[PDB]
Design a protein around this ligand. Structure first.
Ligand code: FAD
Ligand code: NAP
Ligand code: A1D7R
Length: 426
């Protein structure tokens, strides 16, 4: 009645918990047959950003909800199925599921001239019902639309095999004995290449721009555990860079010597891909680093180095586009494509709309959405207040002009957040 929460992944669940703890009435509308967001999608053979080898790359005690620790027997890096079971178990404990409408997909969201939002959902029956809510919290995730490169390499339409995205990818088993090209050097790409490296006859890793490939662990410490260590925050943002790049070279050496393009920037600058596997896979010949794909010649994939390989499939791990089809005008955005959300949550012109989980921190997103949810709940029932709109576009302004200072234009830096200072403001 008061709050329609769109999404029952980790963020929607935190919002529902936050609202339930303030006595605030809400319903949570979720597409999938259950809660958990992406973490339950592999496990149901569902097409989504995950895959059957997906584990957390953040430590469990930093990723679990603050008031609801993951089972003690869980490893540091739980499998997607353990996370999904954890999330379902959270919804049960927090008393959330009777406020959750499963198999219910939100299709339009419009602000009515009196303040309330009209929300049109489509259910199992394919039927549609239109409802009014005081406020709407968007918790729909930002891995919604696959982002293929533009353009495809030439000859893609004549390709003998399957051109697919990591969305359509679930299990390397589905490629047993086949010759597959993985495109990308991000979390998805190295994981899916690693996974193909034990079922495919041959796995090729086609990379164009170089990324810093960091183990999940230095000094035995998870990289996001170190990020919190006082002695690391004790350190200067150049003293740490050197610490990291010296540590990296003791642990893996230099990327060029694994056949990988060396990045054009230090660590932190741009982005870092986490993997314990992909370098070793290369050194074992299980994955073969290749340059960029330049053309598809029938059954073969031709690379920019003139070399060529027969390939039965190409798996594009080029990331995801952030879209909001149910929002007619869409996430408040800048011409540049930069998100414009006051403190990464709040549109400046539309009262009663909130975006939760649309941040990208170094490490786990959980503490951040827990703080976001707690703030939004206090805004919904009035314990907290927003600046005037101009003043909200000013925080947006200095946050944005500050991300160009750190990442220049990039493309998805408009949701990047320092996990330390952000949480401190809550
Ligand atoms: C491959 C991968 C690995 C990751 N690994 C980590 C990690 O190790 N650690 C970490 O902290 N984070 C990780 N993340 C980040 C991850 O996004 C979050 O950890 C977590 O999934 C929180 O997501 P969420 O709840 O905001 O959204 P999601 O998990 O995407 O859930 C959003 C929900 O919106 C629902 N929805 C309902 N109605 C609609 C509608 N009408 N339109 C659209 N959607 C709708 C979808 O069904 C979905 O369930 C990873 C992400 C990816 C893609
Ligand atoms: N869990 C984590 O640690 C983590 C970290 C960061 C992001 N994520 C999320 O996970 C999602 C999955 O993507 P990912 O991070 O695994 O991979 P990614 O970082 O999005 O993929 C990087 C690769 O994109 C390729 N690329 C080049 N031009 C491109 C273009 N115009 N459009 C798209 N891609 C282009 C580059 O080489 P090629 O052209 O050779 O492929 C590059 O190696 C992302 O969307 C992100 O939101 C998760
Ligand atoms: C000390 C050091 C080099 C840290 C580098 C680092 C650590 C964690 C992450 C994550 C976590 C989570 N998977 C997310 O995407 O929210 C993404 N990128 C990261 C980079």
């Amino acid at each position: 009645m008061r709050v329609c929460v769109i999404g029952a992944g980790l963020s929607g669940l935190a919002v529902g918990h936050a609202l339930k703890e303030r006595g605030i009435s809400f319903v949570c509308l979720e597409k999938a047959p259950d809660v958990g967001g992406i973490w339950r999608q592999p496990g149901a053979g569902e097409r989504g950003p995950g895959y059957r080898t997906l584990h957390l790359n953040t430590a469990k005690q930093l990723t679990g909800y603050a008031d609801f620790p993951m089972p003690d027997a869980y490893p540091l890096y739980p499998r997607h199925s353990q996370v999904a079971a954890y999330l379902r178990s959270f919804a049960e404990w927090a008393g959330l599921l009777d406020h959750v409408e499963l198999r219910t997909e939100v299709v339009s969201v419009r602000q009515d001239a009196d303040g309330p939002w009209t929300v049109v959902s489509r259910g199992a029956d394919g039927a549609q019902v239109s409802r009014r809510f005081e406020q709407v919290v968007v918790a729909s995730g930002h891995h919604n639309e696959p982002a293929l490169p533009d353009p495809l390499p030439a000859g893609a339409d004549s390709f003998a095999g399957t051109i697919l995205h990591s969305l359509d990818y679930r299990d390397g088993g589905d490629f047993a004995g086949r010759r597959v090209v993985v495109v990308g050097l991000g979390a998805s790409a190295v994981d899916i290449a690693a996974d193909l490296s034990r079922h495919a006859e041959r796995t090729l890793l086609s990379v164009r721009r170089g990324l810093h490939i960091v183990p999940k662990q230095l000094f035995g410490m998870s990289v996001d555990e170190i990020a919190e260590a006082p002695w690391w925050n004790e350190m200067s943002f150049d003293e740490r860079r050197r610490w990291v790049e010296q540590a990296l070279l003791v642990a893996r050496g230099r990327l060029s010597d694994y056949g990988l393009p060396e990045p054009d920037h230090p660590v932190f600058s741009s982005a870092t891909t986490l993997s314990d596997e992909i370098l070793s896979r290369i050194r074992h010949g299980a994955v073969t680093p290749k340059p960029a794909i330049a053309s598809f010649d029938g059954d073969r994939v031709v690379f920019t180095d003139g070399t060529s390989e027969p390939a039965d499939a190409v798996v594009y791990c080029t990331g995801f586009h952030m879209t909001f089809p149910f929002l007619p005008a869409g996430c408040p955005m800048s011409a540049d494509g930069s998100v414009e959300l006051y403190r990464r949550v709040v549109p400046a012109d539309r009262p009663g709309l909130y975006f939760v989980g649309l941040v990208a921190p170094v490490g786990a997103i959980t503490r951040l959405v827990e703080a976001q949810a707690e703030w939004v709940a206090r805004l919904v029932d009035g314990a907290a207040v927003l600046p005037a709109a101009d003043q909200m576009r000013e925080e947006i302004g200095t946050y944005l002009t500050g991300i160009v200072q750190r990442y220049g234009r990039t493309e998805g830096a408009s949701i990047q957040v320092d996990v330390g200072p952000y949480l401190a403001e809550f």
